[PDB]
Amino acid sequence: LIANQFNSAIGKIQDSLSSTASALGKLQDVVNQNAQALNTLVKQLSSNFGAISSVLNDILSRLDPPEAEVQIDRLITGRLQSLQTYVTQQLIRAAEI
Amino acid sequence: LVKNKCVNFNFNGLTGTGVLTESNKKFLPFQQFGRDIADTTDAVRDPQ
Numbered sequence: 344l345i346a347n348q349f350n351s352a353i354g355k356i357q358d359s360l361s362s363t364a365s366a367l368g369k370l371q372d373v374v375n376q377n378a379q380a381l382n383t384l385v386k387q388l389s390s391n392f393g394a395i396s397s398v399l400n401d402i403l404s405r406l407d408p409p410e411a412e413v414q415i416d417r418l419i420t421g422r423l424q425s426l427q428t429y430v431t432q433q434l435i436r437a438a439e440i
Numbered sequence: 441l442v443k444n445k446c447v448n449f450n451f452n453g454l455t456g457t458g459v460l461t462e463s464n465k466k467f468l469p470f471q472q473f474g475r476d477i478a479d480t481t482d483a484v485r486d487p488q
């Protein structure tokens with residue numbers, strides 16, 4: 344009797360995992376959170392942060408050396424704070440994991 | 441244009457460095473560029 348109950352329980356586990364996909368929300372949430380963090384990190388590159396243009400070769404090709412540093416400084420500060428925000432949140436999430 | 445080698449390319453002021461390869465992106469006329477998520481050119485149309 345115990346052997347039969349155990350076998351039936353294993354079969355029901357197999358059927359439950361086959362049917363219901365949401366069972367692995369705990370793992371899927373981690374994957375989604377990491378992908379979302381990287382998506383935002385990448386999307387930050389398309390932001391001016393106040394400079395004339397969010398692409399660095401246009402600033403380098405358009406403006407003179409004595410003037411480029413203002414725009415480049417704005418971009419560097421913006422991207423640096425973005426990268427620090429990403430790293431800090433990754434450190435916290437890694438502590439949880 | 442030399443293909444399949446790292447080059448510094450300049451198409452109508454659009455500059456960059458990369459490997460230029462023949463492409464299967466079937467984009468319709470009056471379109472020139474392509475774009476990725478980060479809004480940096482991924483495919484481009486030869487002016488000549």
Ligand SMILES: *[C@@H]1O[C@H](CO)[C@@H](O[C@@H]2O[C@H](CO)[C@@H](O[C@@H]3O[C@H](CO[C@H]4O[C@H](CO)[C@@H](O)[C@H](O)[C@@H]4O)[C@@H](O)[C@H](O)[C@@H]3O)[C@H](O)[C@H]2NC(C)=O)[C@H](O)[C@H]1NC(C)=O
Pocket residue numbers: 344347348
């Ligand atoms: C503790 O609980 C167990 C289940 O949780 C009980 O085991 C079940 O006990 C009876 C007889 O052993 C059966 O339960 C029903 O039985 C009727 C008639 O039995 C006939 O058909 C079954 C199925 O083909 C067959 O195995 C039997 O030998 C008979 O030919 C069935 O029509 C019902 O569908 C239902 O199965 C089960 O056979 C049995 N279950 C298991 C998994 O073996 C157990 O009796 C309980 N303990 C006490 C002390 O009552």
Ligand SMILES: *[C@@H]1O[C@H](CO)[C@@H](O[C@@H]2O[C@H](CO)[C@@H](O)[C@H](O)[C@H]2NC(C)=O)[C@H](O)[C@H]1NC(C)=O
Pocket residue numbers: 487488
């Ligand atoms: C100057 O550019 C024109 C662009 O039309 C060239 O003329 C033709 O362009 C088509 C596609 O743009 C290509 O078939 C060839 O590049 C040109 N046709 C032929 C039959 O050669 C033109 O050739 C360019 N100038 C030079 C000196 O090549």
